[PDB]
């Protein structure tokens, strides 16, 4: 379910630490 930064995410609201799913993962929040 919830993931961190470099965790393959679908959207930016699925990572626990409000980040941005840009490079196929959460990174440039």
From Swiss-Prot:
It comes from the Eukaryota. Changing residue 23 to A: Decrease in activity. Changing residue 5 to A: Decrease in activity. It is found in: Secreted. Disulfide bonds join 2-16, 9-21, 15-26. Transmembrane segments: none annotated. Changing residue 11 to A: No change in activity. The primary structure of the mature toxin is identical to that of beta-hexatoxin-Mr1a (Raventoxin-III) from Macrothele raveni (AC P61232). Belongs to the neurotoxin 15 family. 01 (magi-5) subfamily. This is Beta-hexatoxin-Mg1a. The chain holds residues 51 to 79 of 79 of the full protein.
């Amino acid at each position: 379910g919830c993931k961190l930064t470099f965790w393959k995410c679908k959207n930016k609201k699925e990572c626990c630490g409000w980040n941005a799913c840009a490079l196929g993962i959460c990174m440039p929040r």
